[PDB]
Nucleic acid binder design. Structure first.
Ligand SMILES: [Zn+2]
Ligand SMILES: [Zn+2]
Ligand SMILES: [Zn+2]
Ligand SMILES: [Zn+2]
Lengths: 121, 122, 122, 121
DNA sequence: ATCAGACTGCCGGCAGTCTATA
DNA sequence: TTATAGACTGCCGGCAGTCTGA
DNA sequence: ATCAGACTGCCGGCAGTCTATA
DNA sequence: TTATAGACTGCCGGCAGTCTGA
């Protein structure tokens, strides 16, 4: 409503600024992969309908660096698109469907937030 | 870039950001009743350089505002929303000599202009 | 053994220095009452046999002060002689046995260890 | 004063109980070396007159394990005998006198508190 | 369904009164 | 008995969260 | 100018070896 | 002489931030 005009002026916290930076890094990695962008948007678009793994190269430690701060990608993007407060990779368990989950220690890793489930420690 | 906007449309907001919207909604409802205040507030945020007049809302006896079950100080809130998200005390804010109704005054009404206040370490 | 010699050289943490000062304060108010130390020392000496109330004037505020640090008298001494880690009075249960417990609002308080029991806080 | 009789019945917190446990390990450990015990008592007894290094064998990590708690020896004993609030080895600098300070990385290390000085930062 | 005004709780600092001690 | 030093009760402040009634 | 792969620091737990003491 | 009790070194893990180099 009228509030929409005002919230344009709301400034963003440091995290959201970072989150935006983290997403840009993702699209840069995902553009080289063909079709991956649409599957993620479809994955994000609809919760119910399964989606194919969306993958990125997996580091030796598995930590991604974005804008000077390291993190684990599935943690980062699940926090971005599903649970903002998600505290650690311990809170995430992979799904049976996921071809390239985090534990697998394979070459690429699936960062689709809907391939994971949140659990209490 | 636009595709990033398409994806970031799907981003979730932290409890606070969800709250900031609720606080802004509460103010506009309270602020809509006075008719000349609404445009000036937008003009003050719209214009950084030119000063703009006090925008007022009633001061409770203790001075706390309640939005969605959590109380706050009205001036720190909207300063937190529109200027400094990192703001955490009213001790960090010093009113300006311009403000007819600052928080310290203990008057009937309070000025919610984020730009009538100044940020200081303390 | 020889360790006794070395531990004489050991330094004490700020709290243990505070504990000594608080105990010094207790006997000073306690010395005015005759024999109270003996019932207290016997109570501390033997856990099993119950012992008479040892009381101190109860402030309006209920807070005792020793050297700029306020506290609740029954908590302070239960912390000295029974539980060093006692965090707050909620953790303490008075006894049906005790004639004078902190919850009592008379103008005196019984600070007897072994007259209270430790319970899990809410 | 008269309080000394009752204050014996004061209970001791977890740290002090450990401190005694730490001191006991030292002497038992420090008894095989001859004369060290006297020098340490002399070291502690007299603050102004200097005393020779008091030594114990130095591990690969430099950490000493006592009663399930790992620590650095010169830190422990300075904390016991000199500054109880001493937080870390950073706060400690050796004296020009000390023959086997912590930095030396020698076969044995000097745990005499008075061979060290406390420093800001 | 939600907020304003009340309350109590908790926690400090402070000043006038209080206690040693020479 | 007297003067000067440090004590603490009591009072005050801020802070923050709960609850009934508007 | 920014990120991957390294390193060290810090801090715990763990297991095999050591030491009393019966 | 032997076995069983408790001890600790050394090693190991995860964690986190720095730095050089691609
Ligand atoms: Zn997947
Ligand atoms: Zn103003
Ligand atoms: Zn009692
Ligand atoms: Zn030395």
């Amino acid at each position: 409503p009228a509030v929409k005009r005002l919230l344009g002026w709301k400034q963003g916290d440091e995290e959201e600024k970072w989150a935006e930076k983290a997403v840009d890094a993702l699209v840069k990695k995902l553009k080289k992969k063909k079709g991956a962008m649409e599957e993620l948007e479809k994955a994000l678009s609809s919760p119910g309908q399964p989606s194919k793994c969306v993958t990125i190269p997996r580091s030796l430690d598995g930590r991604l660096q974005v804008s000077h701060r390291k993190g684990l990608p599935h943690v980062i993007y699940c926090r971005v698109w599903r649970w903002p407060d998600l505290q650690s990779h311990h809170e995430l368990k992979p799904l049976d469907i996921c071809e390239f989950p985090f534990g697998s220690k394979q070459k690429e890793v699936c960062i689709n937030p809907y391939h994971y489930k949140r659990v209490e420690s």
